């Protein structure tokens, strides 16, 4: 049947407040390919998000990478929100600084 996405949210480099960085949302192991991915800053969709082409895995699933430039601060929250038919509602995964 439908396969549920695995979602990994991570920065390129160890985060330092006030230093520009790249935030990534890597979504894997989903089927069918229809999916909606948003990267969020304080709950608001980030307008400048780059999406890789979607690829297919030999384990019978699709994967894709969203990323954006960001500057971490003490108070800003970042997340990736993923809507897929395998799930009853969109899943929000927070960037975890305790990472």
Q: Can you describe this structure?
A:
The protein has 99 residues and is an all-beta fold. It has one domain (1-98): Sandwich (Immunoglobulin-like). The chain has strands at residues 6-11, 21-30, 36-41, 44-45, 50-51, 55-57, 61-70, 78-83, 91-94. Strands 1, 2, 5, 6 and 7 form a 5-stranded antiparallel beta sheet that branches. Strands 4-3-8-9 form a 4-stranded antiparallel beta sheet, with no helix packed on it.
Helix and strand arrangement:
Elements: E1 6-11, E2 21-30, E3 36-41, E4 44-45, E5 50-51, E6 55-57, E7 61-70, E8 78-83, E9 91-94
Antiparallel strand pairs: 1-2, 2-7, 3-4, 3-8, 5-7, 6-7, 8-9
Task: Describe the structure using short key phrases.
monomer; 99 residues; mainly beta; Immunoglobulin-like; five-stranded antiparallel sheet; four-stranded antiparallel sheet; elongated; protein homodimerization activity; structural molecule activity
Rg, Cα atoms, Å: 14 Å
Report on the biggest sheet: 5 strands, antiparallel
SSE pattern? EEEEEEEEE
CATH topology: Immunoglobulin-like
Domain Ig-like C1-type: 5-94
Subcellular location: Secreted
Family: Belongs to the beta-2-microglobulin family.
Organism: Mus musculus (Mouse)
Task: Please summarize what this structure is.
The protein has 99 residues and is mainly β.
